[PDB]
Amino acid sequence: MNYKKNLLLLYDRPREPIFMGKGKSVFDVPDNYLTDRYRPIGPEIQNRFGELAEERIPVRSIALPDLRIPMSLGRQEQFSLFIPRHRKIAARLIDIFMGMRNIEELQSCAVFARDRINPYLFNYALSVALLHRRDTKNLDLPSVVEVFPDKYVDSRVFEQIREEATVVPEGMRMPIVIPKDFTASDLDEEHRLWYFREDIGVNLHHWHWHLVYPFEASNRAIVDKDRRGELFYYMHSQLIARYNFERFCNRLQRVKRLNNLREPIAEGYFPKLDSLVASRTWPGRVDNAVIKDLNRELDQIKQDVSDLERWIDRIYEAVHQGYVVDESGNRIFLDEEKGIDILGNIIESSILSPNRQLYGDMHNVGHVFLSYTHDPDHRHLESFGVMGDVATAMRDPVFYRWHSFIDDIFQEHKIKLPAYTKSQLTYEGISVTGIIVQSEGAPVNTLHTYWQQSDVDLSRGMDFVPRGNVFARFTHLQHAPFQYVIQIDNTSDAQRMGFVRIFMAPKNDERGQPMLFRDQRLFMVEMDKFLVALRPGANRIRRRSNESTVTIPFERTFRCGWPAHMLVPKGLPEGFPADLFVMVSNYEDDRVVQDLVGTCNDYCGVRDRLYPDRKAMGFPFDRLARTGVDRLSNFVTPNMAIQSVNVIHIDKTVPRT
Amino acid sequence: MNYKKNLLLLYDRPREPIFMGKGKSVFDVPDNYLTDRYRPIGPEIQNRFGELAEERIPVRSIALPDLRIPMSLGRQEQFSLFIPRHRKIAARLIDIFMGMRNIEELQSCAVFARDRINPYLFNYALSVALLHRRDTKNLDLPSVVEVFPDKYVDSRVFEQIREEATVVPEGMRMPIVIPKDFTASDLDEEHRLWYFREDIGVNLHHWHWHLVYPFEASNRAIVDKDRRGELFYYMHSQLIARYNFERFCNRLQRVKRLNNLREPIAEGYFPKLDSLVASRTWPGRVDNAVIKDLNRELDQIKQDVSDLERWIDRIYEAVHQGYVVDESGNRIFLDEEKGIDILGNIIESSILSPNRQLYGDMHNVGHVFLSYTHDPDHRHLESFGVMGDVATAMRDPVFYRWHSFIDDIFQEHKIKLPAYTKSQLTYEGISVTGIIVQSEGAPVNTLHTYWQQSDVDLSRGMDFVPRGNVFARFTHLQHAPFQYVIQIDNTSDAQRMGFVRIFMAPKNDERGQPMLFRDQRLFMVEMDKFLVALRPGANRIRRRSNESTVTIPFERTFRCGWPAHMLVPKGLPEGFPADLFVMVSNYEDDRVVQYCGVRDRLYPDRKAMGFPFDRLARTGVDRLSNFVTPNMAIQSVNVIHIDKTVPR
Ligand SMILES: [Cu+2]
Ligand SMILES: [Cu+2]
Ligand SMILES: [Cu+2]
Numbered sequence A: 001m002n003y004k005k006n007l008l009l010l011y012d013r014p015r016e017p018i019f020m021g022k023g024k025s026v027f028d029v030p031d032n033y034l035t036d037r038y039r040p041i042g043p044e045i046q047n048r049f050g051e052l053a054e055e056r057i058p059v060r061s062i063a064l065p066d067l068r069i070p071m072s073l074g075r076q077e078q079f080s081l082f083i084p085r086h087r088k089i090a091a092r093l094i095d096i097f098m099g100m101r102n103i104e105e106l107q108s109c110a111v112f113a114r115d116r117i118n119p120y121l122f123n124y125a126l127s128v129a130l131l132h133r134r135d136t137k138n139l140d141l142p143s144v145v146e147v148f149p150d151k152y153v154d155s156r157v158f159e160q161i162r163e164e165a166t167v168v169p170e171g172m173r174m175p176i177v178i179p180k181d182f183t184a185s186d187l188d189e190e191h192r193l194w195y196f197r198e199d200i201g202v203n204l205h206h207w208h209w210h211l212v213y214p215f216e217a218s219n220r221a222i223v224d225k226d227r228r229g230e231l232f233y234y235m236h237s238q239l240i241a242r243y244n245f246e247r248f249c250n251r252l253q254r255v256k257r258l259n260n261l262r263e264p265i266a267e268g269y270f271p272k273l274d275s276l277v278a279s280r281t282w283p284g285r286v287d288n289a290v291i292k293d294l295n296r297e298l299d300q301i302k303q304d305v306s307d308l309e310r311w312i313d314r315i316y317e318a319v320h321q322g323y324v325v326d327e328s329g330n331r332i333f334l335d336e337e338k339g340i341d342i343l344g345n346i347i348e349s350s351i352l353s354p355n356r357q358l359y360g361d362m363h364n365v366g367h368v369f370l371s372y373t374h375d376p377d378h379r380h381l382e383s384f385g386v387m388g389d390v391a392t393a394m395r396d397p398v399f400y401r402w403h404s405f406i407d408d409i410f411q412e413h414k415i416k417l418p419a420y421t422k423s424q425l426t427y428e429g430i431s432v433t434g435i436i437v438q439s440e441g442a443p444v445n446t447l448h449t450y451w452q453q454s455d456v457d458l459s460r461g462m463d464f465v466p467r468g469n470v471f472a473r474f475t476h477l478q479h480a481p482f483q484y485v486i487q488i489d490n491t492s493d494a495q496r497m498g499f500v501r502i503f504m505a506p507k508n509d510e511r512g513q514p515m516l517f518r519d520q521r522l523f524m525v526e527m528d529k530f531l532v533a534l535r536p537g538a539n540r541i542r543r544r545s546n547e548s549t550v551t552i553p554f555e556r557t558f559r560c561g562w563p564a565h566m567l568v569p570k571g572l573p574e575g576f577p578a579d580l581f582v583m584v585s586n587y588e589d590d591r592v593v594q595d596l597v598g599t600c601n602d603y604c605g606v607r608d609r610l611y612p613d614r615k616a617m618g619f620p621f622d623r624l625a626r627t628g629v630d631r632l633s634n635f636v637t638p639n640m641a642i643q644s645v646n647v648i649h650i651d652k653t654v655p656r657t
Numbered sequence B: 001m002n003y004k005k006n007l008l009l010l011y012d013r014p015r016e017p018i019f020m021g022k023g024k025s026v027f028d029v030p031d032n033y034l035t036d037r038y039r040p041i042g043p044e045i046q047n048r049f050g051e052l053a054e055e056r057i058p059v060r061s062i063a064l065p066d067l068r069i070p071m072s073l074g075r076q077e078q079f080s081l082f083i084p085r086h087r088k089i090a091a092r093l094i095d096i097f098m099g100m101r102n103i104e105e106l107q108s109c110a111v112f113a114r115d116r117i118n119p120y121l122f123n124y125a126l127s128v129a130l131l132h133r134r135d136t137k138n139l140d141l142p143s144v145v146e147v148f149p150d151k152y153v154d155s156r157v158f159e160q161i162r163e164e165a166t167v168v169p170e171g172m173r174m175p176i177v178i179p180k181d182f183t184a185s186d187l188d189e190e191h192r193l194w195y196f197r198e199d200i201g202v203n204l205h206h207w208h209w210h211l212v213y214p215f216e217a218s219n220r221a222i223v224d225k226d227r228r229g230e231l232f233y234y235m236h237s238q239l240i241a242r243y244n245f246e247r248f249c250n251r252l253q254r255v256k257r258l259n260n261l262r263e264p265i266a267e268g269y270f271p272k273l274d275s276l277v278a279s280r281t282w283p284g285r286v287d288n289a290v291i292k293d294l295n296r297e298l299d300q301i302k303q304d305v306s307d308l309e310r311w312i313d314r315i316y317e318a319v320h321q322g323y324v325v326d327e328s329g330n331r332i333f334l335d336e337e338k339g340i341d342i343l344g345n346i347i348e349s350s351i352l353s354p355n356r357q358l359y360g361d362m363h364n365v366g367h368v369f370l371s372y373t374h375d376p377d378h379r380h381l382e383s384f385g386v387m388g389d390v391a392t393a394m395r396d397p398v399f400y401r402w403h404s405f406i407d408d409i410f411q412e413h414k415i416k417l418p419a420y421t422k423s424q425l426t427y428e429g430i431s432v433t434g435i436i437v438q439s440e441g442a443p444v445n446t447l448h449t450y451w452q453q454s455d456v457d458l459s460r461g462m463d464f465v466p467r468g469n470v471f472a473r474f475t476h477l478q479h480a481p482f483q484y485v486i487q488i489d490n491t492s493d494a495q496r497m498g499f500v501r502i503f504m505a506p507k508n509d510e511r512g513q514p515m516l517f518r519d520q521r522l523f524m525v526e527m528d529k530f531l532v533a534l535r536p537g538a539n540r541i542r543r544r545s546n547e548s549t550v551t552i553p554f555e556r557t558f559r560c561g562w563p564a565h566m567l568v569p570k571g572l573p574e575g576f577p578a579d580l581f582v583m584v585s586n587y588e589d590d591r592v593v594q595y596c597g598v599r600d601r602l603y604p605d606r607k608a609m610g611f612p613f614d615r616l617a618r619t620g621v622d623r624l625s626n627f628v629t630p631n632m633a634i635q636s637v638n639v640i641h642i643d644k645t646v647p648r
């Protein structure tokens, strides 16, 4: 009905009162729905903003459950899901929206609440409720860049957008270029990774992943998704694999983990963001900041560094022991199947953790510690730095150090699992004899990258700015389109089903030697995974880069999955050598019997109960090598193939077409 | 298309070869589709009936997966979904039919298989496939009475139907009366409940319920229906409530549970059925038969009584402990919300059970033990008695004892739940001031029952019988139509939505006083549950007996739902006193944002099944008349039976 489309208007101009009129509509709000500030002059307002509106949306007056807790958070305050207290506020609000009887009342509750609670919080609480209600499915949720550009753009632009919108008439407005490589100069070698850390795409993917797989609320409210623990492990694990790749393409070494929390943090980061909702800027972190015990009375944080250290010591113990202990005292075994999934819920701390009290909230609390080095006891009345918000956490270099450490802990479990036997990863009959890649106007086995400007309308997000269009020009990494061509022989006499699993890693190390397996296995980034039917004899399989199951299209992100333009590492101008790897596994073993919708539920989707692959995530390379194996070229079975690829960057700006 | 209608022809005459022609059609069965018995004389056969057919259905020759497993079960053997081995065979066949994507290849696979596999098995496997594919939806499957009358009718009639059909010309054929109250004489007081145990209607309802909610099925999608565990609890729980009602109307006490499996079973039952597919009869059970350890090597059953006892001991422990343990070792808590649902899947064992290995297959294995007392080690090469088949299980009195026990186990959990507070079952503003019932030509607050003959065409099920019509006359309980009239006051100033929940129980005890709540709560049978919009002030709600959400129409059964004619207990000639109860709950709380429209999504009521009375009374409450809140009402009803046979 219309109602579905009317809720989307709430996302429009988050700080402009709801009675000011969104898009080509306006809400006809009761007087008891007006805020205390504006209610005493309600007559003057409803009339004043009624003009220029095609439609007028009525709203029925209900009682509405108590909004005390939702309103506890200040309006000009920041909102993070990492902070213990905010979690309890969101879960209260989400409960109101995710218990609202009708689509009429959801709209009524929302319209009332919207101008009383924190915009950032409202956006989150609504998102999730709509996302997981059974009568608001298939809904096109606005990009959070468009509603909250302050979390994605240098603060400098805002006063230019205000100038341009006020001075120049619509239609004649110049697109505002968004600064890139702006957080640090060349004295800081970390500045080279701007195109990854600060890319709009990857920050949106991270934010959205945490939307659809929260770690707190209610198991029916989306917490208990199949293998979400393993997902948490793998997704974040691939972030660092991809990051480490991009590091090698900028003449840097692999990211160093956060060994121990008492030693200083070498790499500072000033993010250059200004929260228009908080009306303040995010604090920076200086070079050689030290983690400090937190005592944030307001936020309900009383945590010592030793608490964190204690959790880590215990988690390590469990991993080595090989089992964990639940609240009850019983033992649960970290086996080949569910071990990783359990560990994930323990480490991030999802209510699915079999003993939160013992093994703690290790990952999340780390994000808070790192974000509050500048003001840990609240004596300076300052908010958290960028690592305290999922929306912005990936911008800071320390993210990759903290997430690198966490990964080492997971690894400590994976190296205990028994090596995959020759048998286990052989496909009797199937043999892959070669894989190549071809781009239009480029040699075989060669990928190209470059810069590309794209445009985004940030109009809906610019509160109290003259109406009209406000286009912003993003510069971001892009790759030339390509396609894989895989030669597979059947030699069976029957149609064979198979999973095509495509990863890509560096060929050599930082010192220029052909990488060993033990090293290289951890640097393999997944590039594609798809089902294929093989006829007897010979089969030529072709797969386009844009069909990737790791990626989501341009149009989806701007106008949940990994951004398409970030699919290929940057490489070097002189060319960066890389091993492309493909494996065909026996789909009959890997199959997950299931009924599936597969239509852009941002990647097909996988919002259906189960995850569509019985094998472990990162399956060929998640475990150690079997005896005798030493490098990729002798790890291989017949049903696998390796290919030398060369990744060439070109420092030029192509248009978006 | 036609294809949908052509599959329905497979259900016609299950034991007549598929090339003999069904209805006004015939299949053009290839010569390599003829069975090894019939292939060598294909020429003479194909053109025996070759002219006399209006339509001729072609059938394309396809690959056809290996049908070894489906064909493992003998053709002259009995089926049963309780037997472990049959489950694996059926689930595999279901998988084949289900796995042919095209609706034309399904017809081809079916036509081939039909004459190679066990008819009972075929019928099940097809029924399940059709009901749960997308292309074959809303397809009206023929009543299993019409295709397999042997499971529903005294064997005596069959030789009369054969005589009548051979001797007398069509049009002059007399309807065959089906014997009633034929399994036992008046020396057995259990014989009085024939009209319930042996009623066609209720046996069909039971069979069909297990069709749409299986407990084992390749793909955990069709087994995983919303609250199927709680459904399993409640549905079966209502069977016994209704049975116990009918017992009181025949001067009997409440059904005694199977306290322990070592003690003899007092009540024997000879069902008098003859399987025309097995060409044998179902075995009877003698008086004072004892359960015995099973070793049915063929059927793949190796179970000791102590195994059953061990499962029970463990389930009781879990229920008292208040939690279960999954395969992984984790604990899951039997809370107010999902507790009952979990327990249901545990008891009887649905693949949804969080730990089958520990808590076992308790309900199902019980059905097998009870059905094999006469031959537990297969030394006598005899098949299972009536309790071994869902289609026939309700005929035996022991069914209600075994299902009575099982219910007590569920109860043990329900009595742990906290009593519903005055608050929880009050509807602020709403007040029900009275409920009555009226039948045409009968005093107020009075229900009538009687016997009624109905007719069913068993023609499609009578294999190798001269074609024509074969009408059978069933005698079954019936009630005079009636309607409820409910007086509800709003006193709010706004339109209030509400759920009307109507139950009926016996009024008094054996000593002649008002029954106490603790007792009476378990004897309340659901009569209706429907949504109503109330205007401010006063509202007069009227509801017909035939609008009941517990029931399905006549036409569906004869031509899943409780039979309409069985909606009202029998009562006595002198009149049987009963308390009619109604409650209006706040639909806003009970609502679930998504017999009762299309079934395939959710159970439309957030409240527990049997909601007013599933839990113990709050402090101070003692009998129904002080359990009541304003938004409830009680009414004395009198149920009168009349021993006469009315026409339709
Ligand atoms: Cu994250
Ligand atoms: Cu993180
Ligand atoms: Cu049953």
Ligand SMILES: [Cu+2]
Pocket: B363, B367, B393, B403
């Ligand atoms: Cu049963």
